[PDB]
Design an enzyme around this catalytic site. Structure first.
Site, PDB file in Angstrom:
ATOM      1  N   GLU A  62       0.872  -8.401   0.644  1.00 48.84           N
ATOM      2  CA  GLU A  62       1.086  -7.022   1.173  1.00 48.84           C
ATOM      3  C   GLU A  62       2.572  -6.695   1.312  1.00 48.84           C
ATOM      4  OE1 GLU A  62      -1.312  -5.075   0.877  1.00 48.84           O
ATOM      5  OE2 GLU A  62      -0.434  -3.279   1.817  1.00 48.84           O
TER       6      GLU A  62
ATOM      7  N   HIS B 135       0.829  -1.239   0.000  1.00 49.65           N
ATOM      8  CA  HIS B 135       0.000   0.000   0.000  1.00 49.65           C
ATOM      9  C   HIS B 135       0.857   1.281   0.000  1.00 49.65           C
ATOM     10  CE1 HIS B 135       0.074  -0.537   4.555  1.00 49.65           C
ATOM     11  NE2 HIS B 135       0.324   0.763   4.463  1.00 49.65           N
TER      12      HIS B 135
ATOM     13  N   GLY C 205      -2.684   5.521  11.541  1.00 48.49           N
ATOM     14  CA  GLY C 205      -1.517   5.668  10.651  1.00 48.49           C
ATOM     15  C   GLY C 205      -0.744   4.371  10.497  1.00 48.49           C
TER      16      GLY C 205
ATOM     17  N   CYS D 250       2.852   3.327   8.740  1.00 49.00           N
ATOM     18  CA  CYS D 250       4.159   3.695   8.144  1.00 49.00           C
ATOM     19  C   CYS D 250       5.059   2.463   8.191  1.00 49.00           C
ATOM     20  CB  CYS D 250       4.798   4.851   8.902  1.00 49.00           C
ATOM     21  SG  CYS D 250       4.404   4.855  10.671  1.00 49.00           S
TER      22      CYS D 250
END
Length: 182
Positions: free
Chosen positions: A72, A41, A146, A148
């Site tokens: 992923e 992503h 979030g 990251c």
């Protein structure tokens, strides 16, 4: 604070860079030579920023299992002038559960962050942001607005990269030795 944090710090200090795409800043794990991993992503393109330096992407491959299901993980080869320490011997060979893992993050927003996440379950299937995903690890996590990425370790093993959460649990994509045979 203890030997799990010692192994995590050793990985962070030599085998991570800050990667920036159009989708944000991510913790990026370097595995060997100029090869690193990032969540799919992140949407890696032809150019990426590595520690705020414009870097050409030589190759990027969004991994899927042999059922053609999302994993992923994107494997990126960077046009960088320096190799990573080879850490492939710290990668597990098979899908597994783990005790006493640490999730480690290094970005502009969250520098030198280490989280003891405890027990890690081989969760398997997850509908991740609407995308059927396989080989997911799960650990209880008061989910933080979030993604990251992140590095999941035990003593002596680099087992996954953080890819999401639901408020209460966190989820990582497995790293397997077989992804990085050259």
């Amino acid at each position: 604070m203890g030997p799990g944090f010692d192994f995590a710090q050793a990985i962070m200090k030599k085998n991570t860079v800050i990667a920036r795409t159009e989708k944000g800043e991510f913790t990026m794990l370097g595995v060997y030579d100029r090869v690193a991993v990032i969540p799919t992503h992140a949407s890696v393109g032809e150019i990426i920023y590595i520690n705020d330096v414009e870097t050409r992407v030589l190759d990027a491959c969004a991994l899927r299992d042999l059922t053609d299901t999302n994993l992923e993980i994107t494997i990126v080869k960077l046009d960088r002038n320096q190799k990573f320490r080879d850490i492939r011997h710290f990668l597990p060979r098979c899908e597994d559960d783990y005790n006493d893992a640490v999730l480690s993050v290094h970005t502009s927003k969250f520098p030198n962050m280490y989280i003891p996440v405890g027990q890690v379950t081989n969760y398997g299937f997850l509908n991740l942001g609407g995308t059927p995903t396989h080989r997911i690890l799960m650990y209880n996590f008061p989910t933080r607005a979030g993604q990251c990425g992140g590095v999941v370790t035990t003593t002596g093993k680099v087992i996954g990269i953080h890819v999401g959460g639901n408020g209460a649990q966190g989820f990582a994509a497995m790293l397997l030795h077989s992804y990085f045979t050259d």
